[PDB]
Design a protein around this nucleic acid. Structure first.
Ligand SMILES: [K+]
Ligand SMILES: [Mg+2]
Ligand SMILES: [Mg+2]
Ligand SMILES: [Mg+2]
Ligand SMILES: [Mg+2]
Ligand SMILES: [Mg+2]
Ligand SMILES: [Mg+2]
Ligand SMILES: [Mg+2]
Ligand SMILES: [Mg+2]
Ligand SMILES: [Mg+2]
Ligand SMILES: [Mg+2]
Ligand SMILES: [Mg+2]
Ligand SMILES: [Mg+2]
Ligand SMILES: [Mg+2]
Ligand SMILES: [Mg+2]
Ligand SMILES: [Mg+2]
Ligand SMILES: [Mg+2]
Ligand SMILES: [Mg+2]
Ligand SMILES: [Mg+2]
Ligand SMILES: [Mg+2]
Ligand SMILES: [Mg+2]
Ligand SMILES: [Mg+2]
Ligand SMILES: [Mg+2]
Ligand SMILES: [Mg+2]
Ligand SMILES: [Mg+2]
Ligand SMILES: [Mg+2]
Ligand SMILES: [Mg+2]
Ligand SMILES: [Mg+2]
Ligand SMILES: [Mg+2]
Ligand SMILES: [Mg+2]
Ligand SMILES: [Mg+2]
Ligand SMILES: [Mg+2]
Ligand SMILES: [Mg+2]
Ligand SMILES: [Mg+2]
Ligand SMILES: [Mg+2]
Ligand SMILES: [Mg+2]
Ligand SMILES: [Mg+2]
Ligand SMILES: [Mg+2]
Ligand SMILES: [Mg+2]
Ligand SMILES: [Mg+2]
Ligand SMILES: [Mg+2]
Ligand SMILES: [Mg+2]
Ligand SMILES: [Mg+2]
Ligand SMILES: [Mg+2]
Ligand SMILES: [Mg+2]
Ligand SMILES: [Mg+2]
Lengths: 68, 96, 197, 49
RNA sequence: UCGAACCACCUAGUAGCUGGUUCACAUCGAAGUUUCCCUCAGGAUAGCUGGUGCUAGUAGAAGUAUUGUGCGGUAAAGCAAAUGAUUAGAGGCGACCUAUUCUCAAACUUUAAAUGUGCAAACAAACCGGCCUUAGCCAACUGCAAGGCCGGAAAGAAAAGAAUUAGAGGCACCAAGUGGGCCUUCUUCGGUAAGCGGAGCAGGCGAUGCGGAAUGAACCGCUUAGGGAUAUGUGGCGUCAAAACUUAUGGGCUCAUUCUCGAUACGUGAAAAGGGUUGGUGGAUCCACCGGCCCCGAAAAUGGAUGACGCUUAAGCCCAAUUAGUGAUUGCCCAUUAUUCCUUUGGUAAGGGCGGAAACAAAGGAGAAAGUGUAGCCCUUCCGAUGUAGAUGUGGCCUGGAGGUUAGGACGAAGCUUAUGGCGUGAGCCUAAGAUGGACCGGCCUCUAGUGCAGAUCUUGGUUGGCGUA
RNA sequence: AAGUUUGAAAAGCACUUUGGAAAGAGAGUGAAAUAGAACCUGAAGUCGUGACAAAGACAAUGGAAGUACCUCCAUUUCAACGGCCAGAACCAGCCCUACUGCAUUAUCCUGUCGGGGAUCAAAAUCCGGCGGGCAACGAAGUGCAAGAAUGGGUCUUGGUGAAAUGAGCGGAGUAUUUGUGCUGCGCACGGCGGCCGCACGCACUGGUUUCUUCUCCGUGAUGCUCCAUGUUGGCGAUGGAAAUGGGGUGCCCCCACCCGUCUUGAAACACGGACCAAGGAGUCAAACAGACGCGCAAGGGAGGAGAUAUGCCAGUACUUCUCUCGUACUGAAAGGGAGAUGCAAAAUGCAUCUGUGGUGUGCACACGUCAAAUCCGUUUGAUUUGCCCAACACC
């Protein structure tokens, strides 16, 4: 026998029971994979240099603190 | 119906202002049983022993605009066999 | 009536008592509930909550990790001050990958025999919480630590391994069975390794 | 309605009620009515002129 | 016993289908929709729900506004504007051109709403001047791009209507039921229509009583721990039936002779066309026109329905009041709603006390546990309480046996009987009596299971109305 | 199908009598015959009999609240004493009453002149000008309202002072200071084009006291919690007593469709449903996963078997190698196989080994600072800096 085909009667109520959650903020999950490659490669070189600078900065802080 | 409040119609009381005069007065319903039981002054006044019995109450507030009154009885409620029968309304406690 | 639709969804599930059957755990809970109620330090309150927590949420810690974090704190501490006491609400286990350690004072619910031997041989002391309550009633000059929870096999198994961007392990006893279709491009299709979120 | 609670919440209520009684006095009412009518009539006439 | 005999066995054959499925309270509480399936009386999958939590407790919040800035082609409008239809006259000249003219379009449009929809409105951010790096751009750089370091400022967001919150954000794990829906308000498609079939937004019934509409799953009011008092909602105040014992010192209209005027929200009777009273526009010197109430138009099958009687100085219809040109503000009646008081139970619950202050013989008293859960350690305070399918909790109840511990019994164990009371919200527990019985058995902590019945055309035994009847 | 399960022991009912007999009535055995023969206990359902309650025809059953009658039930009381029933008084709280001032009035009020109307002549309804204004009786159907210094109800709440926090109780004064009225200067406000007005606005807590009104002090817990205290009558003087709760039956007024089930929808002209007893349905094993409890931990643990306490004991006590899961993954396979820092740039580079590979956000702790509260000892919040544990994101 025939039956109901389709309806959207109760769906809005179901979606709002646990609410419609907002988006993740922009500073999270901001991966750069798939972007324009030439700019991606150049940015990798700068980040490698910055890590070496960070290590050097900590050593100087330790030596200065020990000297009081 | 709500059985813990009773409605009483009094002769010559036909307005709401008339019914206000009787708020707080004592009310009695008199009937008889089948056997002689204990009463007030059972031993002091043996002449009172009888099958006659009474239930007491008080007037609480008026009812409607025509002089009907609401009555509350001490403890239990008045029996349904008293519908359409005589009720006594005394003049005490007196405010005059 | 009052319109309080969806008000039960703001209730939170928190444990108020322990499920443990250990009388010594019960004694410690009694002592630190008293301290948390009657003092003004956050250390006692945190210790009381962690004592209430369950075994799976009290992951053990490594002696090498303790040593590393203690050194990283000590490099920026004046030489006229004493090193803090490491405090773990859980178990401390030995580490064969690190042989040389400094003298440390550690308080924990339980020590393995190897860890106790290593600490004593290095020249430290192993303390219990009743001793700690007398040495530092308010938790002054301490270092609260937790063990690692990620890296457990159950955590590695959580999730569906057939959706794009997922790298969870499937529940299977035969390692070589669930290859081919759905995991290789040559067999119909391959699950995508990456997906933007 | 409760006297002690009202006084506890507002200590100036005694002065307010004294002023209210003074206003509700009869001779004060009559004198004020006559004086106010005279003042307003004179002011309006002067403003017009 | 035959469109494939009978007997035993494989066989407790398989069933997406029909029937059944045994104690109590407490905290929460749905779906008939999406995608795939030899799928359409079934599954898997997401959604809705419960349990368990983790994390720095006001955080990365919002089914709502305001201001700023984007998106749109429905309603309406138009054909004297493009496309497509379509009536008539006129001028130039039968045809054609030229301006008009009458009527239009879900698959036509120049224009274009109301309700909508995206983004932003200072704390991992944005703003203003150092320095470092790049194998990036440019003819070059001290120009642009990118990642960092140093420093400053910061009504922490003024004033102009210049937000608000019974406004703690985020992250996981395990799993149930459901996957036949139906009704109503606005918008609609098919159909002559349907208590018909199919959709969009929202609210309901299902899963839910209570108070009203006489009666009704869905209409009106309101939504539910156990009870009082006060006051209201919808609906009412001639009797039935509580309230104007038929209120007013308010105004008008209406007469209905066999389904017997009217008092029918949803809704559960009535058209074109016509004519007794009471009103209103125009025209004369009495005529047309159009309103109120009433009447005709108006024919069925058991005897009957404003709910019944009845009502006509209404107890009918339209307005309008609250004790009445006298003095200014609430006539009365009825709820599982509102306010308030008492008691219970559970919290995302909020606080206080817990080193025995001192003293005290009979012939002021007791208690005072560092505590999830009890006969709750004690006291104060605030908030919630309904619920099918379903989930979970309970120093929650009951039955046969085991390891311990502590008792009872011939001065009477188990079992059985009850107008035997007492206790507990309840499952149940305990006492009394036997003018019953004659030999075993209770409480508490753990362990264990063939562990709780009202119905399955349930099994076995007994009984029974029909019946002193056929 | 069916326990011959009487009783300790047959001591298994001699004898009298009524009856054809079966049996009945007596007598006797036995602790019991209510143990009399297939005999322990002897339930439910159904039936007989006696006593009682009543009762129309609303099928019966059911709910809520009373009453009449009964009660082999429980508890309480019986003397300057009640834990029973009533009345009145006062206290705290709550509820509902009476008592009311400030603004406003003009399309208004009242005279006079004119015209207008009507009459029998008038007046009045109505329309212009001009002059005065408060419709003020409880003026007004009008815009707000704060009037209890201090009338009744509470069988709708607790109490009789075992903490009374009081404008109310106590003490001392009997004067303060709220408003009304009048009024000073400066500012503000309105009108005109600086002067004129100010209904009485702000400041000087401006002056005056004519009216109006009370004002000021006081009791911590050395009480952690619960219970314990008035007045006047009736009943109760130990009884076959009174009283209060339970329990039973009838009656009155009101309320109230038959359970279980499939279903969008059941009470239904949808199915299963005469009564009772006993029985009757999520179990056992294996593989995996999650939550929770316990032991050990870079290790954890067997199993099979043996050995001797051990020859009461299918238990407990003891044991080696080994085996298994894990500490390392990846490729079809031949195969290969994961630290950090510094110098440097070698087709296996070199050197050290107390150490998070880096950045952002991130408990507690340490160093400062600022708020609010404080019994002045300290608390509750924020924030700066350092290290950041667990964890998340980007490399
Ligand atoms: K005149
Ligand atoms: Mg369907
Ligand atoms: Mg790992
Ligand atoms: Mg044959
Ligand atoms: Mg079977
Ligand atoms: Mg079969
Ligand atoms: Mg099927
Ligand atoms: Mg079924
Ligand atoms: Mg709920
Ligand atoms: Mg197929
Ligand atoms: Mg079916
Ligand atoms: Mg249109
Ligand atoms: Mg248009
Ligand atoms: Mg056109
Ligand atoms: Mg503003
Ligand atoms: Mg189905
Ligand atoms: Mg249909
Ligand atoms: Mg259903
Ligand atoms: Mg409803
Ligand atoms: Mg009707
Ligand atoms: Mg009546
Ligand atoms: Mg007419
Ligand atoms: Mg009729
Ligand atoms: Mg009719
Ligand atoms: Mg009616
Ligand atoms: Mg409560
Ligand atoms: Mg509930
Ligand atoms: Mg058994
Ligand atoms: Mg009985
Ligand atoms: Mg069974
Ligand atoms: Mg049974
Ligand atoms: Mg016997
Ligand atoms: Mg027998
Ligand atoms: Mg029987
Ligand atoms: Mg005049
Ligand atoms: Mg005084
Ligand atoms: Mg019924
Ligand atoms: Mg059907
Ligand atoms: Mg049914
Ligand atoms: Mg039918
Ligand atoms: Mg069937
Ligand atoms: Mg091994
Ligand atoms: Mg060897
Ligand atoms: Mg591994
Ligand atoms: Mg290999
Ligand atoms: Mg390969």
């Amino acid at each position: 026998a025939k039956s109901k085909n389709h309806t959207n009667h109760n769906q809005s109520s179901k979606n709002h029971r646990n609410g419609i959650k907002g988006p993740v903020p922009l500073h999270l999950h901001n991966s750069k994979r798939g972007s324009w490659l030439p700019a991606l490669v150049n940015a990798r070189r700068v980040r490698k240099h910055n890590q070496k600078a960070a290590l050097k900065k900590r050593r100087e802080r330790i030596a200065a603190f020990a000297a009081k | 119906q709500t059985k813990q409040t009773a409605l009483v119609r009094v002769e010559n009381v036909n307005t709401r202002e008339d019914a206000t005069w009787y708020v707080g007065k004592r009310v009695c319903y008199v009937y008889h049983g089948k056997k002689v039981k204990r009463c007030v002054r059972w031993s002091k006044a043996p002449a009172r022993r009888s099958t006659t019995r009474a239930l007491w109450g008080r007037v609480t507030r008026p009812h409607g605009n025509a002089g009907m009154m609401r009555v509350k009885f001490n403890g239990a409620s008045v029996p349904a066999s008293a519908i359409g029968r005589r009720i006594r309304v005394y003049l005490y406690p007196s405010q005059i | 009536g009052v319109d309080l639709t969806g008000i039960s969804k703001k209730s939170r599930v928190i444990r108020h008592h322990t499920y443990s059957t250990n009388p010594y755990i019960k004694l410690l809970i009694k002592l630190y509930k008293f301290l948390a109620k009657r003092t003004s330090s956050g250390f006692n309150k945190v210790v009381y909550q962690r004592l209430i927590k369950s075994r799976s949420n009290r992951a053990p810690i490594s002696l090498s990790r303790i040593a590393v974090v203690m050194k990283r704190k000590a490099v920026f501490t004046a030489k006229s001050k004493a090193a803090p006491i490491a405090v773990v609400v859980g178990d401390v286990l030995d580490d064969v990958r690190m042989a040389r350690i400094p003298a440390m004072r550690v308080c924990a619910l339980r020590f393995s025999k190897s860890a106790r031997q290593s600490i004593v041989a290095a020249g430290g002391e192993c303390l219990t919480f009743d001793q700690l309550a007398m040495i530092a009633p308010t938790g002054k000059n301490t270092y609260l630590l937790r063990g690692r929870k990620s890296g457990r096999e159950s955590v590695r198994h959580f999730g569906a391994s057939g959706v794009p961007g997922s790298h969870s392990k499937p529940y299977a006893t035969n390692r070589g069975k669930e290859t081919k279709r759905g995991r290789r491009t040559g067999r119909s299709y391959k699950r995508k390794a990456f997906r933007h979120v | 309605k409760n006297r002690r609670l009202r006084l506890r919440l507002n200590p100036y209520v005694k002065r307010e009620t004294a002023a209210a009684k003074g206003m509700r006095n009869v001779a004060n009412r009559d004198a004020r009515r006559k004086a106010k009518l005279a003042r307003v009539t004179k002011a309006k006439k002067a403003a017009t002129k």
